[PDB]
Symmetry: T
């Protein structure tokens, strides 16, 4: 199950970086809609953390060794972080969360694919559930942004 | 008691159509304010459904036969429905909810008058409670829309 | 594109809206021994039906679709037929209507599952699978009440 | 005076109604016991609510509520019979319906008198209780295969 | 007879509820705001015993008193007309009197069911007697007195 | 006091002052029964604030403009305030609360009549509910004080 | 205290078999009343399981070794099991539960007497509590079946 | 305001007026973001009332006599009230709330300083806790206004 | 669906025996770690009971006849039971739970495969969910025992 | 009921000292298992305090005068106390709790017997309930220690 | 942190005695007001016990050894205990509670001062929080008794 | 680090790294005690994250710009991360948590010190509350490890 293990660990790194990006958005946010979207980032972060732990502990359950240092997370994630900036607009912050979420949905589709191909149905379901929820968020964030989900 | 029964049945039809219209607004909404107004439609729908069930079971209690098919709801409602359209602005969507709620408040006043006249105080009270909260919603929606309630 | 996955989701929106109306009718027009139990049971079924409806509609939206959202659309697209409310229907005839509504929904959900499986829409596939599971369980229980096997 | 009187009438009738419901609850036998036995508890609790609220309204209005079994029995227009296990479920439910029809008519009377005297507070207490009792009458009659026939 | 004492209790608990309700309603004087809702706790507890003991009697094949006529004729408690001029201390003194009668009745219930080998019924009277006696201590304590069981 | 708007706004002022009086009682109370009456004042104050907000927002809903400054509250209220005094007995504090509540119930009656006369049943219902509870409190308070409610 | 130990272990076997029988009734039930009685079986099963664990752990506490395999349960129980059959009427199902419960109350009576005579008052109480509730159930079950409890 | 007692009483007056100002904003608010900011005012008001009560009770506890009439509040407070106005923008509404909060945070700093100087550590902590939370609100409000907290 | 039905019924038998074994472990456990592992056994039992009822009622739902007697469970189960023994160490006790869980996870895989081939996706999901949770427990139990999960 | 009274009072003093010993164990505990047993001592302590207050209040109810000073507790208790010592192992700490419990269970038996002889049935059930729970704890502590309960 | 450690331990002793005195007041109380003040002694005892555990565990944390036997409590406490006496009036009982509380607040001031001088700010805040609450209780008790707090 | 803002950011970095190490301990833990200590890591991580968020917020509130990327956390933190290793004993894992907490306690003392010196009492409080709880955890972890807290 080497490829299911590799994608789980990929998600551990990516989700760790995604959490950090969401926390940055939470902190640096400024503009009309702050009061709604600032605590909304805690909800997204909590949900991201749930996926992270579950996917890491599935990796552990399968005999793997999850990345578990900030260096491992940062080096292995395909997500890129920039310095915090208070002058990013609300719309831009929401569009970055959408970018991250589209990335995660694509990653989860890959985890779904590989786990299916390896016959790892438990892992497959974990990815599917995460994908479901993330794609729903993309619809909502896009809607706020006056756009179709464009999945 | 023939008219109290009639107006309660009218309310069953109109509430069923108002539910559907609220559901459309909930689903087709796009633009800034989505994250607050999308779940708000669920609260409004649940409140509408509560009136619908209480007025219908009052009608039953009084010996009446509630409308209970979509054809009945559609044909007897004075509310008109259009196809859902994502390009309707948030402010236009809220304007639509306000016009539905104005209609309902007026319908509930007719219900109050009719049942008051017949001495059906229980029905009278159903209408008064429903009118009270709908009018408060009208104030709030109009305030969001930068307007006086204009009841 | 997921053309048929989207189509079956919207089919479900239509049928669930009509299913909801039928369960409400049963709820209101019910008379006979067993009323005190089956009348609020209809509220539980309605709420579950409403849950699938909202979730299937919002999956369709998520996918770039446009859900049916008027009574006219629900009526004309649903395969479920409605009749006028009638208080002289027996309890066991009411429960039998509910069973036939549920058999239809279970079959629709099966169609949703197969169609989404084939197009590789696994999220949609799981929504249908969960809904089918529950509907089929209620069929067992309703049928038991009616002194019958589930006969899926 | 009349609002006060009808409040006290309800105190007595609701006390006897509670007794009858408790009897139905205890002596019930037959298919449907397991649903209807605890149902009598919900009805009793609701009846006790009206009883205390109407009695306390009477106190608030300067009255003196009936507060002995003797007063309840001889002021109430509801008749009690000895407990009897032979009564069918449908008959037990029919007896509850009959008691509820009485309470609903009495609450209408309370509504009328209080409306005439301008005691809108008492007026609402009667309306709220009546609404709920009539709803029960529908459900009870439905179980019995019947229209509410208010 | 366990069955007889259970039915006596049904009658007396019915009358005791009426008396507590009377105290709840007619109470006036300093302490009303604490003692008025306290009567609700007592009545709820009294009604708990009433139902428990009645349905034990049904369980044993008995026929509980289920009419005010039966309650009033069989009960050994007496009722008087409600009176707003009764003092807070008098009202509470009346509550103690009722509770003392109840505990003694539950004592009799305990003895009789014990002699009869009916341990379930026995246990019902024991739990009830325990709480009533605790209440007697507290009421008496408020009244400046020892419980004097 | 020609109309419902007027009496609602009167309530707004009187309830504000009633709130302030109850707080005074709560703070300056001394003597046997403090442990029970002190927190009871909190209950009364929260109930009062409840009416205050309901009535103000009914007035807003009707298109009026609620008093919303202390000057407005204090000048338009017909209740009189005095300096906090620790040497007022418990019985005196309770008597003063009774006085406030008697005033409030009377005002709510005037509110009921004015709304009844102009067919504003929503407002009418608001006054009726508030009057019911206030009158119940007078009974209980009077009972503590060894008195009939004497409405 | 060998008798109390012996009866606690009997009850362990019998409660285990009683649970199985209730679970069969739960599964195989068909007919009007199913919707009430099917979940009612869960309540009974939970209560039986509470007795089982309590009685078992009292036996452990006393220095005994409770029956703890299906073979021990099945061979030591005096209750007899039959193949699940869907065609049994609801009435027959409830009659069967009554038979089981009568057996248990009688067993609990034996437990009460045996424990009383050894002066094991804790075991005594355990049987008394269990017996009280089972006899209450016999009444209700017999009431549904149109009969007196006939204890 | 030379001592802990004096600043605590100054706090009582200012908090009373702050409360009235927040209620005005709550009532008179119109514009996009109403549905979020209107109930937010209730949260602020409840927090404010919590400080009002604790500081007043602390004063009582220290042997002082709290201001407890509208006249005392309005005269002693350094906050100015103006007539309610429905044509104030949300941005303007939130800017006023910010002005009030900066005033309270400054007053709480004074109470902190004075109490530390007196060695009244209990009073000191009350001012510190209240200041902490108010400064946090300033950050959030400012961020909604697209600005740094600028304490 | 003959094979799905067969494997569901196998699960009913095996889960019934597994519950019995877990209960033995719960009862007979001695050694350091009791206070933790004794209630943990209750958790595992509740979970095992949940699969048992759900798999049995999926079988009923599919037109099957679940095993529903202790004799059917003992004879159909591939799990073997032995007399309770206080002298088994905690390590031995947890190792035994691990063996049981590995057995169940493998039966659930069989269940998953057979339902997959037959196109019974509802049953397939029931096995997959049960398998996931059991594998997770095997990881934790194994971790307690100082080992990799070694699925 | 002189001896019933006496033994209740013995229990007040002994439960007082037992509470103190358990608090010492709670505080001075060191070693593997701390994280479980440290909070467990709080559960035991709360349970011990429950019996203490219950038995004291029963004594008061019977016309007695509970020991209510530490002098009285110390002099009357048969339990002995020593200075806290962090160097005691976890296993000896738990053996010490067991000895306290064996004592209390013996005392509760004495209370049972005495109250039984005087026909104080209420006091009798109080000791029985308490004895049942303590003996259960003895089984559990003993199991942790790898021992039979040896009552 | 010698002085901080010493004063924490003095609190352990005095708080242990305070709890005993309150329990005495709880049990022996008689007179009008019993029904309010009897349960109020529970609230006080719970709060006292919370300080006792916190201060003891702060001392353990700091490397000290808490008093943990009744002899240590009784010999180290400055609080004096007398035999329970039902003839003490309610107002005398409350007066005794006031005196204990006055003693505890002064002890907590000493605690504050000593920890502040030593730079043990964690211990410092512990004393401050406890002091705040005790002084509030003093105001309330004094109020009941018709007096100023007179801190 | 030379002001409160500087130490707040240092805390953001260190808490981020502390969270990562705790998550590693949580994941890679094997040994007797796993079932207790694995979820206890979750409690420590929630708490650490509470500090991270409020310290970051406080920095934002003060006009600062928190580290908000993994690169920034990793490079600014003085904690070192090593690759996850299943072979580390439970006791070694616990000792690692203790080392981390000792570091955080020292950091928080530095934060307390710096903020006190600047007169930033709000920040000071934040650090003091955090230090308190971490030191208590150090006591408990050390107790598990059979050691004095050795602060
Ligand atoms: Ca648009
Ligand atoms: Ca059949
Ligand atoms: Ca090992
Ligand atoms: Ca050691
Ligand atoms: Ca005295
Ligand atoms: Cl799209
Ligand atoms: Cl828009
Ligand atoms: Cl009719
Ligand atoms: Cl049948
Ligand atoms: Cl071992
Ligand atoms: Cu985890
Ligand atoms: Cu309904
Ligand atoms: Cu939705
Ligand atoms: Cu009442
Ligand atoms: Cu009952
Ligand atoms: Cu408001
Ligand atoms: Cu157990
Ligand atoms: Cu206060
Ligand atoms: Cu089941
Ligand atoms: Cu106590
Ligand atoms: Cu502790
Ligand atoms: Cu945050």
């Amino acid at each position: 199950l080497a490829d299911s293990k590799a994608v789980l660990n990929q998600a551990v790194a990516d989700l760790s970086v995604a959490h950090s990006i969401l926390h940055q958005v939470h902190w640096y946010m400024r503009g009309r809609g702050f009061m709604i979207w600032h605590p909304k980032m805690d909800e997204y972060m909590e949900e991201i953390d749930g996926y992270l732990d579950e996917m890491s502990e599935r990796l552990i359950t399968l005999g793997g060794a999850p990345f578990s240092t900030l260096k491992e997370f940062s080096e292995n994630s395909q997500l890129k972080e920039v310095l915090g900036d208070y002058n990013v607009t609300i719309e831009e912050q929401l569009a970055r969360v959408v970018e991250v979420f589209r990335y995660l949905a694509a990653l989860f589709q890959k985890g779904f694919d590989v786990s299916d191909e390896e016959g790892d149905s438990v892992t497959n379901d974990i990815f599917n559930v995460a994908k479901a929820s993330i794609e729903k968020h993309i619809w909502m964030l896009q809607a706020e942004l006056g756009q179709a989900p464009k999945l």
